[PDB]
């Protein structure tokens, strides 16, 4: 609408996605390391042997 309130709650969806997009794009770089901890420990023999 022509109300700034219409623009103001249009802001508070943008400031909802702008925190979420970094959250999922962060979650891959966080997820990148977590794979390396699996694929090392999958090929890691226990060092007493």
């Amino acid at each position: 609408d022509g109300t700034g309130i219409s623009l103001h709650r249009q802001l508070r969806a943008i400031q909802q996605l702008a925190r979420n997009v970094q959250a999922v794009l962060g979650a891959f770089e966080r997820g990148t390391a977590d794979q390396m901890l699996h694929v090392l420990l999958e090929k890691a023999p226990p060092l007493a042997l």
């Binding site: 109300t3 700034g4 309130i5 103001h8």
Partner: protein, 47 residues
Amino acid sequence: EDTEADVPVTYGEMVLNGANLVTALVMGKAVRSLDDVGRHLLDMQEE
């Protein structure tokens, strides 16, 4: 005694501008024309 003179412009405007809009979402408070009644009540505060 006919054909008089009245306003064609539809009567004025209330918009929730920065006086209202700040009070609108932050507290939930709304005052019709907070500009002057904020101004005047700030000045009668200093008399």
